[PDB]
A paper describes a structure:
To gain structural insights into ABCA4, we first determined the structure of WT hABCA4 in the absence of NRPE and nucleotide (apo ABCA4) by single particle cryo-EM. The overall resolution of the structure is estimated to be 3.3 Å, allowing de novo model building of ABCA4 for most of the protein. In addition to the polypeptide chain, 17 sugar moieties were built into 9 glycosylation sites on ECD, which further validated the sequence assignment. The general architecture of the structure is quite similar to the torch-shaped hABCA1 structure in the nucleotide-free state, which is consistent with the 49% identity and 77% similarity between the sequences of hABCA4 and hABCA1. The discretely folded TMD1 and TMD2, each consisting of 6 TMs, contact with each other in the cytoplasmic membrane leaflet through a narrow interface between TM5 and TM11. However, other than the limited contact areas between TM5 and TM11, all the other side surfaces of TMDs are completely exposed to both leaflets of the lipid bilayer in the current conformation (defined as lateral-opening conformation), a unique structural feature among all ABC transporters and first observed in the nucleotide-free ABCA1 structure. During structural refinement, two clear phospholipid densities were observed in the cytoplasmic leaflet within the TMDs. The two phospholipids (PL1 and PL2) were found in the shallow pockets mainly enclosed by the cytoplasmic segments of TMs 1/2/5 and TMs 7/8/11, respectively. Since the presence of PE and PC molecules in our protein samples and the phospholipid head groups cannot be distinguished at current resolution, we tentatively modeled these densities as PE in our structures. The R24A/K672A/H1017A variant, designed to disrupt the PL1 binding, displayed significantly decreased ATPase activity, whereas the K1371A/Q1703A variant, designed to disrupt the PL2 binding, maintained a similar ATPase activity.
Available evidence suggested that ABCA4 may act as a flippase to translocate N-retinylidene-phosphatidylethanolamine (NRPE), a reversible covalent adduct of all-trans retinal (ATR) and phosphatidylethanolamine (PE), from the luminal leaflet to the cytoplasmic leaflet of the disk membrane. Here, we show the molecular structures of human ABCA4 determined in three distinct functional states by single-particle cryo-EM to 3.3–3.4 Å.
Numbering used by the authors: 1 to 163, 209 to 224, 231 to 239, 244 to 456, 460 to 492, 496 to 861, 915 to 937, 945 to 1164, ...
Write the structure that this text describes.
Amino acid sequence: MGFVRQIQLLLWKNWTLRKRQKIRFVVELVWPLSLFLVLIWLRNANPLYSHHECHFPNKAMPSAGMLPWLQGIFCNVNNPCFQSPTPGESPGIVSNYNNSILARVYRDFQELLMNAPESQHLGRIWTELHILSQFMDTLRTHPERIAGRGIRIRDILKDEETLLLERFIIFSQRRGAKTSLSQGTLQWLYANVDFFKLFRVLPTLLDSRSQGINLRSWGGILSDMSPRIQEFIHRPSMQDLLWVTRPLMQNGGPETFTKLMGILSDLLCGYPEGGGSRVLSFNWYEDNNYKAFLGIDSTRKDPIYSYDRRTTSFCNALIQSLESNPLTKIAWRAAKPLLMGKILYTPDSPAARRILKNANSTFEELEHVRKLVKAWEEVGPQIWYFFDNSTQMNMIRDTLGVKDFLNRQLGEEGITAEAILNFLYKGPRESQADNFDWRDIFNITDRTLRLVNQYLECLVLDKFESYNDETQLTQRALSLLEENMFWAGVVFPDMYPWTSSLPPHVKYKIRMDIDVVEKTNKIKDRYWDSGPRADPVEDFRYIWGGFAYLQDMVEQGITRSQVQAEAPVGIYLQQMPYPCFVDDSFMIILNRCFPIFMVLAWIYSVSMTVKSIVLEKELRLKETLKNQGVSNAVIWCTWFLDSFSIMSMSIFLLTIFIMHGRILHYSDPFILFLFLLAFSTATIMLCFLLSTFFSKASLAAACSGVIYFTLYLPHILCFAWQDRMTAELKKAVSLLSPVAFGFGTEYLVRFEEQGLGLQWSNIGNSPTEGDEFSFLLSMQMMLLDAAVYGLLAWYLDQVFDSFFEREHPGWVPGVCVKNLVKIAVDRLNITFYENQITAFLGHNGAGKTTTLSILTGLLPPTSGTVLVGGRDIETSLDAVRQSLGMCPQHNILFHHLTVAEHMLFYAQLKGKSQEEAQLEMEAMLEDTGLHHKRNEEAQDLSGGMQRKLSVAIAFVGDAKVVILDEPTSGVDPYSRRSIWDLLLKYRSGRTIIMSTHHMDEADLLGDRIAIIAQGRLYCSGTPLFLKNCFGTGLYLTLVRKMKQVLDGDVNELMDVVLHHVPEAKLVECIGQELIFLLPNKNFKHRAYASLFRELEETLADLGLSSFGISDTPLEEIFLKVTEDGPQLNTGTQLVLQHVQALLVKRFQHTIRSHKDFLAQIVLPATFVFLALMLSIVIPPFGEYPALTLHPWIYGQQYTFFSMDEPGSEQFTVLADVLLNKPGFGNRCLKEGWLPEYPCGNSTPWKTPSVSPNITQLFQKQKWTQVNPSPSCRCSTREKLTMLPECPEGAGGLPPPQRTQRSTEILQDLTDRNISDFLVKTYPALIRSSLKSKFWVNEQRYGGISIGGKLPVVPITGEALVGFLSDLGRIMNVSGGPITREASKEIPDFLKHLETEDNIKVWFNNKGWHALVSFLNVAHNAILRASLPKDRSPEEYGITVISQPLNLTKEQLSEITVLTTSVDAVVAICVIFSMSFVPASFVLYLIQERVNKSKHLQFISGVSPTTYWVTNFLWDIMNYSVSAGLVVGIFIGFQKKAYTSPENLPALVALLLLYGWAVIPMMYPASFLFDVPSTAYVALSCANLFIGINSSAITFILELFENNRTLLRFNAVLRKLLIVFPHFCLGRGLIDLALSQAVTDVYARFGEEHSANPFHWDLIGKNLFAMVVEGVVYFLLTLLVQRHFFIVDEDDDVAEERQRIITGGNKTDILRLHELTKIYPGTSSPAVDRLCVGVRPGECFGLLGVNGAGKTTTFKMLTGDTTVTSGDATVAGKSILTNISEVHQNMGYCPQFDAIDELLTGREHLYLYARLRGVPAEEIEKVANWSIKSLGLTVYADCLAGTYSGGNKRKLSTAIALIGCPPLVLLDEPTTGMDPQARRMLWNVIVSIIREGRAVVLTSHSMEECEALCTRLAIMVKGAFRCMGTIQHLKSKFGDGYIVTMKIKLPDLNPVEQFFQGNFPGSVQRERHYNMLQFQVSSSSLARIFQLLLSEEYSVTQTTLDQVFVNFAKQQ
Ligand SMILES: *[C@@H]1O[C@H](CO)[C@@H](O)[C@H](O)[C@H]1NC(C)=O
Ligand SMILES: *[C@@H]1O[C@H](CO)[C@@H](O)[C@H](O)[C@H]1NC(C)=O
């Protein structure tokens, strides 16, 4: 035998079959690639974002002064990222602003001019210049000497002597004023007293009032200070200042608002490397925008514009020109509520007033500036006056500057001084001379300072308004907020309007709207992003929204109201640094789309494999191969390798595209191949399992892809609960292989993120930190699911005188049976011989099927043995199957396999090599007469030659024994002979056994016969022996002609046979016939011989046409051995009878069917229920929670601290109330604070332990201060990692730790670099905190750093007004009323600009509320660090709450969109669920359109209108029940908008009209589908493609308020899609929810809205469109159905001329003139002209040559198809105009069975009785009679459809015979009836004809058509070739008189010679041993010339089927 040869063979056939398909083959290799191209377009549409490190500057809170606060607002607007650590994140520094040119200028100034060891002596000059021009230069009132007065006084006095003088005066002074040394002394009675003082030209002795003199103590320093000043101007700092300020003054310089900001930035900020980078965000889905990516613009409407009361005419023009200008319009929107907003402080009481008094320092300090600027309006004119008309300016430097000694002093002056210009630019008034450098420096300062003055008064700086309850606050809040003038509103909940003293725990709320606050639902991003979260606009709403500034101000006030410390500390916020990173947005969609695409790419290749496996099992092609000797395992193992080699060829291309398409960049392309392979191997063994469920191929092909897809959906639910999925639930759910695929895909993507592939090294491990489910478990569980599926499918497949005769010794008995019994076969003993055909009879299986089974070898015997060549089968079960051939009743052929391939396959399977197999095939193709069309497909053969091939296969190889049962069943009489030729040819050397039931076939061929009576041989022998063993006489037939009234005179007919009358005579006389019956017995050759002889010449005299003399039928010899006009309803009553017959017909079918009760009821309810249940997992959003802000709302976490600046006081207690008992924050109060977060117990400081490798690394190696512990590898060029690699080189050693009794873990970072420790240990934290990528917590959120100081301004307060007042007094100003108050606050104004001793807090922006949670901790420790030393600071605290401000009807205009978008999906679920019932109603119509049941209804007369009307009527009422169940489920869920006393009518009407309008829509789909399953799965997809893409597009398309073409599309689709009801139901179920939302936001605040449905605005036009299209479609289905609905032979002449020219019907029933049926056109009509006529009492035959075209005659006669101008009439009317009047006078028995397989036998009769007549009380008796006539009473109540094989045919012949029609059409009314059953039908069909009712018959056999027909007509390609009776036609178109005789040691020499009398014939036909067949002539002379023989004899007439072969022979 073989085991590896069968496999080669089966592989060959399967490979050859999977080549003639060529459209499954192409799809199975192209569809996956067309599915993975989109996944490459998505790779290229989602690029990659990387960035370097980020170090961020810090932000000062108001408590850190005002100058740092405002400078930090302006400098850090964009929050820059700096790549290199900022100067403010150092241990002792906080400032962060060197390198501003305005600080370097100051440093240079203070360095070289000030602190001048050289001079430092301008103090002397100032003291002298002030002591003179304050005391002496005035002299206005004080008294003096002779030479003393205010302005001009002389000295001359005290002279008693009377008075060259001009010469003396000129010598005294040289052009000198009152404001020389010796010349007059040597020229000298005047030198006695008149020279009282020698005070000569020496310049310093005049002011000797009290004490003082100094002359050249001015120039010695005035020439000192020059070169240093010049050098200072030559420093680079002043160079840069002057350079930068060159624009910004020249001509429209500041216009670009990037030059201006650039100048200001380089001047005030100092930031390096360009400024910074501005990291971005890219999320939009944590914020629910849905219009950030969609392109819509998202702005609130700009607020109301109203002129205000008491602001200004400038502060109303600006607010408008700056707001309605669509270029700024947004910055202003954000900045306005801060600088003109307003703050509201509900609990108006003394204590809150004190808090808000102390919380007000910032605005006070900020109006101290407006006063100082208003003072210029007063001091301006005074400076003007002093510099224009003064006694000290133009009277000391313009009226002077001596000018002669002054000129001499100027001669030694500097280079560029210009005393002339120093006089022109020092008092020129009435000049208008011009530069001018004098007044263009003063009018400019006015123009630029009064402008600032009139800008600064727009700011509102009094903004605390009180109230008394929260409701009034909220009312004023929305009133202001619609104007854009609202800051927060503060609420002190636990105090009363009479409270006076503060409790030692104060809490408050900040209530702001939601656009400037973080949402209080979420506290994290749901999906982790790998980015710093440092975007200035979306990620910092607690800063530009002003929440943090107000929080700081109020906490400072609360502290200051109960501590009285008078030593402040400010707060700086610092953001923690972040490492390098890459952000890939593909890895989000890869992780979700890879498994979907992979599962969806095999969805077709799975179904087309279950299809093949089940189909070849449905054609019984598997039990054939199992009988032939093939084990089941080989079958499966070949199926596996068939399916495997196409998966394995598509995988090879998937790998290439995935790798080289850059979907995966670096991942070892061999492991991915070997990973997809396991999925394919599990999939195939799933197909093996799925096949063992189904029994019909078409159903499996549809239900299998659906199961494959459904099995994957658990991964959706396992992609949410990633948290509570342990290791075991991964090891257990992963038995479903498609989820084990996704569980490995996630590790694939997680590895690809890290910069690593899989690389054969990490697949066994996991990056998920000890989750013990590696990547290998996925592979190793798919390769286990395969084994489980295979080994479950295998088992589940398994579970499902004498009578015998003398036998010549010259015969070799090949097969011999020796008493085999089984329990059936009682003492059976027969021998089948060598070359001989044996016809093995027996009724059905009483001894035939059982015995043939053993002879074949299937089953063993019970008692006896069998020999095949002398060797029992039970002993040689295998090698005996070498000779046994066999063929079963059905065909054994493979579709798509050519004929020669069949011969080769079945030759080689028996055991042969290709050589001999090919040789034998070539011999067989020549012996079989199929050498032509040898390479044709096994289908598409004629159908008789399919049987010819199926019986030629049983002979293949060397078959010594052939068993074949009914080889010729069901082929036309011309193909039976073609088959018989084969058997008569291969008969030569092998035995053949031939079970059959055709009785003539057992005789025309067959050499022995055996009859199995009741389990035993009851006869045997040759046919002649059997005829003689029973021996009844001859059958003389006599046929009379006509001249109607033909003939019929038995008087002269019986008289002729009365002379030799034997025994029984006339046995029949049917119309124009005269059958007889006579014995043979006692030879009497002369007697008989003389009869025929004499009759021959005396024939034409009597009137007969001819005569025959047949023997005894073989069927009659086997038959006796086995076990032997009511009136009709019509009219409206008839129609009211039809409409009640059909309803009962459908009702009785639905009760008994349960596969209806599924798709009619169960599925709708379950699917809508699931939709609803997954619709309410979302609650009806309230307003917003409170969310007390404290740092434990995050999980376990690490905090830190850092005592910078130690030893100092107030910091060693601030560092202790923060670590020790009171702890961080506020959780541990002695009393309360949220008894949900408990307090525990602390542990001592404990440094962790370190690997020795590290400790060796640090002390041995030499590090630095700028380069501590080693760096981290960043993304290079092709190894882009998500986060850097970071070796065992973190910040350094682990620092001390602890566990605060809060349960946090703080670590002490004192004396260490923090921005090195934090950037390098972050990845090692979030690698252990990742592993899910949802709701990660990061374990580190903040820490404090106590210390930092910025150097404050050095000059004190009063020391500045002391100087300013003196400067004023020296120049006559004296200020006024405003100035004397602007100088009041100047000593307190300078202590509030900076703080000098202040802390900083570090925050991690990846947790949303973590800024204001640690700001509170800081402000909470500052309180406890300063309260008096006997109050136990464990009790004090402050807590902040948030609570946003109620939404405003436009905020909700988007929560509505986000809320109704789930109801827009429940609507699609409802449509998809309800579109199952109408698709179930259509499968029934398809089932009746095929199998011709509908046509059968129509023939009886059901007038298609009433058929369709009754179907629609039943379908509506059947659908109403499911609709009512859906209404019940909505009422149960009690939802609003659908089940409310005004939404029930809308919902119910909307549900009912849907079915009403959609049922008639899908009726036309019943005319173009012929397989129910394909129709179901092609309607369930249209009712989805039209359900989604019509209900959703309008919804999505309404959210575009612009483009003016999107609305153009929307408003016209909403009118163009109203043609079909899926739209009319989607736009109804969505609108009934939108209206509810809109009428439910109103009821939130007062507004009333009571809109109703049924109003044509929402659901009126829908309910109209449904009613109209529920009728137009129905009329369409009433029309799509209305479109559907020479010479001749010498015996055809009589029928030609009977009714054409004579006209002779006058009583006939089927006048049927020349009818012709021409197709559109091929050559000629299939039916040509034909004339026939049927009399009342005879059965027409109408045989017809097969294929020539006969069925078309019945099609025309039954109205099935259309005639081409014929003429056919029935008894009273015609066939062309009154067809409904001729379809009640005829039955019709279809060739194929047309019965509903769910009712029963009896109610088919009930139905068809009702469909025609039979009033109500007679149906009972009519149906009773019909059941017993045909013999059905045993089975008459057992669901036709279980009826075996002939009860169906009996039923069809019963219902065709109901009532009493005068015409009956029978089409092959006996097909699978055993030979006893046929008689019980033929008797009936003769009983009718005896009554005068005609019958037209048709059959493939020539037996029945000979048994009960009275005339025939053979049809050939034309019309006719004969008419007349049987006997009349045998002779007129045949020959015959076969003669047989046994030669009584026999020899056959003398017989041939003695046939000397009979030469014209004698073809001899046979001779085995002594039997002699012969065809003599037809003169019946043999009967007289046989009485001198030489034993037995016989002379029969040729059979009727010999005539048919003769007619069909020529064609
Ligand atoms: C501005 O200053 C100039 C001095 O250059 C003076 O003449 C003039 O009156 C001032 N006012 C105006 C409006 O120019
Ligand atoms: C801290 O409290 C007590 C101290 O008496 C200690 O025994 C206990 O184990 C610690 N933890 C808790 C939760 O009490």
